[PDB]
Amino acid sequence: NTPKDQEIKKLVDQNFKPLLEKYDVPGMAVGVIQNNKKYEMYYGLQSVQDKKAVNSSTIFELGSVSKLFTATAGGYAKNKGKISFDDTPGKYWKELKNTPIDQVNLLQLATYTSGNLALQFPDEVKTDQQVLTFFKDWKPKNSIGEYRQYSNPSIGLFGKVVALSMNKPFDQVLEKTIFPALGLKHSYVNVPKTQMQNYAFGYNQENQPIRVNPGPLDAPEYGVKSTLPDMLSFIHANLNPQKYPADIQRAINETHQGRYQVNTMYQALGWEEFSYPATLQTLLDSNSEQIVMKPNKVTAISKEPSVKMYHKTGSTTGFGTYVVFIPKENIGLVMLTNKRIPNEERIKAAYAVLNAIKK
Numbered sequence: 001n002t003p004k005d006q007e008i009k010k011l012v013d014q015n016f017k018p019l020l021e022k023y024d025v026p027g028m029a030v031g032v033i034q035n036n037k038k039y040e041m042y043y044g045l046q047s048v049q050d051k052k053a054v055n056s057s058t059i060f061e062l063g064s065v066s067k068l069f070t071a072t073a074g075g076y077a078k079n080k081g082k083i084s085f086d087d088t089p090g091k092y093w094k095e096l097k098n099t100p101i102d103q104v105n106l107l108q109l110a111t112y113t114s115g116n117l118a119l120q121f122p123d124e125v126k127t128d129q130q131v132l133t134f135f136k137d138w139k140p141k142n143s144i145g146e147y148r149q150y151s152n153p154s155i156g157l158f159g160k161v162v163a164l165s166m167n168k169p170f171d172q173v174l175e176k177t178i179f180p181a182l183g184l185k186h187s188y189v190n191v192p193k194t195q196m197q198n199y200a201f202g203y204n205q206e207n208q209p210i211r212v213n214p215g216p217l218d219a220p221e222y223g224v225k226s227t228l229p230d231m232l233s234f235i236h237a238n239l240n241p242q243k244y245p246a247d248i249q250r251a252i253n254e255t256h257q258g259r260y261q262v263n264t265m266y267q268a269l270g271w272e273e274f275s276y277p278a279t280l281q282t283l284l285d286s287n288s289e290q291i292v293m294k295p296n297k298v299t300a301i302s303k304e305p306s307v308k309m310y311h312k313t314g315s316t317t318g319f320g321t322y323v324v325f326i327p328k329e330n331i332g333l334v335m336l337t338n339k340r341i342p343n344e345e346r347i348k349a350a351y352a353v354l355n356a357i358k359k
Contacts, residue, residue: 031229
């Protein structure tokens, strides 16, 4: 006798709402999409000092979830014939021709297997020439293609190459091509002055207000800011690629194609992929120190799972994000917070909610 919207709201209250007090989080948005129906749940404040409530207009930083848009842009360029994933970056960034990095192909950059790229660029790498110099001064370590080391500069370089192949800056690739194609109208790389009233403050571990600062290749690495409705629309696109033109549909499918495995995790383009149903510990393993912070041998796909799911965590200094979707259940979930909470808690709460929602 309890409507579905209330049943979903109860589950989110039971599993996500307690994190607000536990981690002193000022604001949170949680969205679920099931069978094309959308459910939006907002908690707390987008700005504590302004007493401004989180709502459908609130803009949050997506952190590494931004890489999903980078991956989509790459799949688009690839299916338009502008790039091949077997190309090397010096084909597009001419100053990298005949450098060591020009031995690494685009898929290997996008999926973190160059063998010598760390989590972040060096702190001192700021300007555009310093980014080029960094890649000019790059030398291999581990054999190329053998080891996955999660890396922002790696997929950042992929994004820069994608932009070069489309003859537009990367921010324009998203704002002029990819976001319009996905029907996202409240998503930005650069939030305009006329929308700053909707840009949440982020909050650091001392609950002090902050927002993301500029950095090298920030746009393809962590540059996107979006709202909960827009993120539900992005999940909807991933659940129903067949509702988009050939180019964007094929781009989305590109991002869903598993490329290799590390144990139970399939590395797709941007997305991490798993056999469904996935155990909680499979999903937690994807965010372990061993997988996130250390290099791991990759293995070829053995089981190509017919029934699968996908997820991605992302953070900035002041924000947390988690997105997950299960195609054959026609369901997905987005969590946005304006303070970081542990990845494990995001994964656990979403697992509890999605598994309890009535089919």
